[PDB]
C-alpha cells in the first residue's frame, strides 16, 4: 500500500496472513465469511464484493441454502418517498426449517415476529438468539454460521461461514 | 373509566421510549409495522403514508 | 419471616383456544407456552394490554378480567352468566 516492512513481518488481512521473505509475501488461500449487505435505498452487495442497484418493488429473495435447504432469506421492496428512483427496504423475512419450519419477520420499527405473534427480545430457543445489540438494533444468531442485523429502516447484513 | 396514574399534558401523547411527544412525530402502527412520522409507502396497487399518527391509506 | 407469603407468579389456562397456558410473571410480563410476548396481544378473544403502562391486564371475552401479578395484586371480574 505504498509503505515499506522489513522481511519476516507478519500482517494479517482480515480473511488471513501473509509474510515477507525475500521480496514476496507468502499467503494462505484458506476461506473467510462473506456478507451480503442491503442498505441506503436500494444498493446491493453481494457475498464476493461486488456491488450493483435494483429498484424492484416486490419479495424478492435475498439468499438461500441451494444443495440442502438449512434456510432462506426474502426481502420486500417498496417505494419510500415521493420519486420513483427511491426504492428502501421495509421488512425481510427469515425462514428455518430445521426448526418447526417456523418463520421469522424483522418489521419496519426494530420488532419481530414469529408467525405472526410478537416477541419480547431476547429469545433463546435452541438454536437461534435473537436480542439488540446497541438496544437500537436486533441481530439474529441461528448456530454458529448465521448473523443478522437490523431491518428497521433497511441496513440489513449477513454473515456466512465458510461451510456454505 | 376515569383512572388514577402517571399522564402528561393533553398536547403531549405517549411515546414508546418512555417520553410523551406531541402528535407531530407519533408515528404509525399499521400491520403492526412501527412507520416513522414520514414514511410514504405504496406497492404497487395501493398508495399509503403515515402524516401525524394515523395512516392515511389509499387505492 | 415465616409469616409473609406473597404470590410470585399466577397461571391462565383457556380450554377454547388452543388449550393454551398463559403465565404471568413475577415483573409485568406474560408468557403463552413458554414463549415471551410483547403487548398487546390481540389473538381472537383475549385481548391483554397494559393499563398504565405498569400494570398487565388480561380480557378473555366480555365476561372476564385480570389484573397484574408482578408484585402480587391479583384480581379478577366475573359477570353473573358465572
New interface residues.
Given amino acids: 500500500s505504498g509503505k515499506r516492512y522489513p522481511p519476516g513481518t507478519s500482517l494479517s488481512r482480515d480473511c488471513n496472513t501473509c509474510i515477507c521473505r525475500n521480496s514476496q509475501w507468502i499467503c494462505s488461500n484458506e476461506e473467510c465469511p462473506g456478507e451480503c449487505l442491503v442498505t441506503g435505498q436500494s444498493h446491493f452487495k453481494s457475498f464476493d464484493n461486488r456491488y450493483f442497484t435494483f429498484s424492484g418493488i416486490c419479495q424478492y429473495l435475498l439468499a438461500r441454502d441451494c444443495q440442502d435447504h438449512s434456510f432462506s432469506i426474502v426481502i420486500e421492496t417498496v417505494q419510500c418517498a415521493d420519486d420513483r428512483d427511491a426504492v428502501c427496504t421495509r421488512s425481510v423475512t427469515v425462514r428455518l426449517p430445521g426448526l418447526h419450519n417456523s418463520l421469522v419477520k424483522l418489521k419496519h420499527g426494530a420488532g419481530v415476529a414469529m408467525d405472526g405473534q410478537d416477541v419480547q427480545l431476547p429469545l433463546l430457543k435452541g438454536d437461534l438468539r435473537i436480542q439488540h445489540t446497541v438496544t437500537a438494533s436486533v441481530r439474529l444468531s441461528y448456530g454458529e454460521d448465521l448473523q443478522m442485523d437490523w431491518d428497521g429502516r433497511g441496513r440489513l447484513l449477513v454473515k456466512l461461514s465458510p461451510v456454505y | 373509566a376515569c383512572?388514577e396514574?402517571?399522564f402528561c399534558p393533553p398536547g403531549l401523547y405517549?411515546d414508546e421510549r418512555g417520553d410523551c411527544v406531541p402528535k407531530a412525530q407519533c408515528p404509525c402502527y399499521y400491520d403492526?409495522?412501527?412507520?416513522?412520522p414520514e414514511?410514504?409507502?405504496?406497492?404497487?396497487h395501493t398508495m399509503c403514508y403515515c402524516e401525524d399518527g394515523f395512516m392515511h391509506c389509499t387505492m
Avoid at chain 2, 403492526?32 to 416513522?36: A, C, L, M, R, V
Fill in positions: 383512572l396514574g402517571c405517549m403492526g409495522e412501527i412507520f416513522q414514511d410514504i409507502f405504496s406497492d404497487h
